[PDB]
Amino acid sequence: MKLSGVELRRVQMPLVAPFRTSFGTQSVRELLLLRAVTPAGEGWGECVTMAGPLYSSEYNDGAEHVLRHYLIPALLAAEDITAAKVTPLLAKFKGHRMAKGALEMAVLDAELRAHERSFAAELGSVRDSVPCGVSVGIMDTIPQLLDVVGGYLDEGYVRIKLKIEPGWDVEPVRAVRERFGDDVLLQVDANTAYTLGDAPQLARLDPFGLLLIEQPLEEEDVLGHAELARRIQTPICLDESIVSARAAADAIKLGAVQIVNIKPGRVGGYLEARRVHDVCAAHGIPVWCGGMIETGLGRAANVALASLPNFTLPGDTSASDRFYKTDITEPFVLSGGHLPVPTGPGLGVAPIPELLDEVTTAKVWIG
């Protein structure tokens, strides 16, 4: 293919209910989408960055900028474009994975459509449906939490993931376990909230049979994770830390992780995410699909991804409604706690134009 141009749209979507993590609160979702245009057709890309630089250094505005000034142009200048070549083409630019990730996706979708192949086929899906779990935010009250949980479990959800924070650990957990039983699948996510020094505290969760603890320490603190693993019974799971397959392998080698969360944009692409998957598998490390409160675009890609053989744990692949009343594509609807893998070319999903426009806030065409 040859790249004709990309259309950068800013989008804002209201969340059904406010989302609280260790970094803050979310009431609304500001996305960034790309519409890649090649001679044959279009492809869509969704960017996982958020308003500010709280999960990671990347934020919507910095993305747009790098995309606009550096990445996109870079692609426009080459003769042949292939999803795979995107990387090597954009390699001179340091970092900015979620943005490079976004570009890749659009390109890929377009590429996959042209050949009439689904994201799932390309990625190597072995399943047609994937078990879904859910991520529950920080509550203001235990009771209000128990409700929410109970709600999700009722919806058919297979696993409960609890956002945690210093001052919202053990109790919330104790509570859930106590009320909902030990049989539930429960895990926690600190989004880098603690320190090695907090070990005893975290060690306090031992007794609860949590599947994992996701990113307790900062992104850069791999050795610390390995140390912490030594001190707690709860399995370490890395999110933020995993910026690449190489990163995964290093972490695995150093004993800093036992289970891996795979976030495609985080790692800079669905292509890279597959490698990550492959690397983990090779080392016997289980993986699961992570989420970034995406529209049915990323959602659709994630679902395909998550049907890969090593994803042996339910992912943050929740139904559409968990965050949006009105999704910009056909909605994703839980069935038997599962979500179905799209069958169509590329994403197998596309924005409903009427719908898209409504929530569009900006638009730019780079040709």
Ligand X SMILES: O=C(O)CCC(=O)c1ccccc1C(=O)O
Least distance in Å: CB of 65 to a copy of itself? Answer: 6
Q: Which of 160, 186, 237, 248 binds a copy of itself (CB under 8 A)?
A: 248
Instruction: Choose between 14 and 124: whose C-beta lies nearer to a copy of itself.
Output: 124
Partners of 363 in the β-ladder: 9
User: Which among 92, 100, 163, 253 is annotated as catalytic?
Assistant: 163
Does 292 engage in binding with ligand X (CB under 6 A)?
A: yes
- Residue 70 interacting entry, from Mg ion, ligand X, a copy of itself, none, C-beta within 5 to 8 Å by type: a copy of itself
Q: Is 363 a catalytic residue?
A: no
Backbone CA torsion sign across 221, 227, 232, 233:
positive
Cα–Cα dist 224/359, whole Å: 42
Cα–Cα dist 119/348, whole Å: 8
Cα–Cα dist 314/134, whole Å: 9
User: Which among 94, 263, 325, 363 is annotated as catalytic?
Assistant: 263
Does 239 engage in binding with Mg ion (CB under 5 A)?
A: yes
Cα–Cα dist 265/270, whole Å: 7
Instruction: Choose between 29 and 96: whose C-beta lies nearer to ligand X.
Output: 29
Partners of 30 in the β-ladder: 12
Question: In whole angstroms, how far apart are CA 41 and each of 37, 157, 225, 275?
Answer: 6, 37, 45, 27
Q: Which of 135, 241, 258, 307 binds ligand X (CB under 6 A)?
A: 135
Q: Is 2 a catalytic residue?
A: no
Phi, psi values for residue 171, rounded to 5°: -60, -60
Cα–Cα dist 232/204, whole Å: 8
Is 307 within any annotated ligand binding site?
no
Q: Which stretch binds ligand X (CB under 6 A): 82-90, 92-100, 268-276, 284-292?
A: 284-292
Q: Which of 169, 214, 221, 327 binds Mg ion (CB under 5 A)?
A: 214
Does 234 engage in binding with a copy of itself (CB under 8 A)?
A: no
Report residue 77 as tokens.
């200048």
CB 340 within 8 A of CB 128: yes
- Residue 325 interacting entry, from a copy of itself, Mg ion, ligand X, none, C-beta within 5 to 8 Å by type: none
Cα–Cα dist 202/167, whole Å: 11
Q: Which of 48, 66, 102, 136 binds a copy of itself (CB under 8 A)?
A: 66
Q: Which stretch binds a copy of itself (CB under 8 A): 163-171, 172-180, 223-231, 315-323?
A: 223-231
Least distance in Å: CB of 343 to a copy of itself? Answer: 11
Q: Which residues are catalytic?
A: 163, 263
